[PDB]
Amino acid sequence: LCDELIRNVKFKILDAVVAQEPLHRGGGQIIPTARRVVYSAFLMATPRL
Amino acid sequence: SLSLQPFVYPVCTPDGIVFDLLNIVPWLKKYGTNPSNGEKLDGRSLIKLNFIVAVRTTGNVYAYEAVEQLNIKAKNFRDLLTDEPFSRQDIITLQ
Amino acid sequence: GVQFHAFGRVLSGTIHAGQPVKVLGENYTLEDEEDSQICTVGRLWISVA
Numbered sequence A: 001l002c003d004e005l006i007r008n009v010k011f012k013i014l015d016a017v018v019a020q021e022p023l024h025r026g027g028g029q030i031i032p033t034a035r036r037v038v039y040s041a042f043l044m045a046t047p048r049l
Numbered sequence B: 001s002l003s004l005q006p007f008v009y010p011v012c013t014p015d016g017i018v019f020d021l022l023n024i025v026p027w028l029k030k031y032g033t034n035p036s037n038g039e040k041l042d043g044r045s046l047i048k049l050n051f052i053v054a055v056r057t058t059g060n061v062y063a064y065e066a067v068e069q070l071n072i073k074a075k076n077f078r079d080l081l082t083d084e085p086f087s088r089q090d091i092i093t094l095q
Numbered sequence C: 001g002v003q004f005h006a007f008g009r010v011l012s013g014t015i016h017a018g019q020p021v022k023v024l025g026e027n028y029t030l031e032d033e034e035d036s037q038i039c040t041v042g043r044l045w046i047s048v049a
Helices: A031-043 B024-031 B064-071
Strands: B054-055 B091-093
Touching: B024 B054, B024 B064, B064 B091
Parallel strands: none
Antiparallel strands: B054 B091
16 A cells, blocks of 8 residues: 555455466466455555555 | 676577676677686577576576575575576576 | 674683683574584683673
């Protein structure tokens, strides 16, 4: 939001779709995807400073 | 290694440097040895690379920032997936 | 102003002047040895106010 540390926010992972082969598909490149998912969860939850 | 530029034609020597294919050909013609190590190298020994960043070891794409952070963390230099040693220098940046 | 000196109480051990000490890091002193930078402190002395 404003490059500040997050506090008092439980990001509940509802449903996920994993790759069948982590060596063939993306297995180590899911952490920026998880960071983008956490950013979209924090942005779409009506935040407050 | 030598030019500090993007390789026109990527290659690698057993030294394991990323000096495209310029530096190696010149050193082989003059010395017949690898410029870094000074060990004998032939043209045949050179390995040519086939023509968002990618790690050579994992051969996986990553956010550039994420890759750099893993390479330089507490002893997490190698590579998140493989845990094979990997440096910032040998990260390939895709245009 | 340029030279810094450390201070602290050792737990169990005594090396007087000549014996160097492998310095440990804050977070770089795990099982994965990252930075030690072993030097020799030959001017270790007690101090007052």
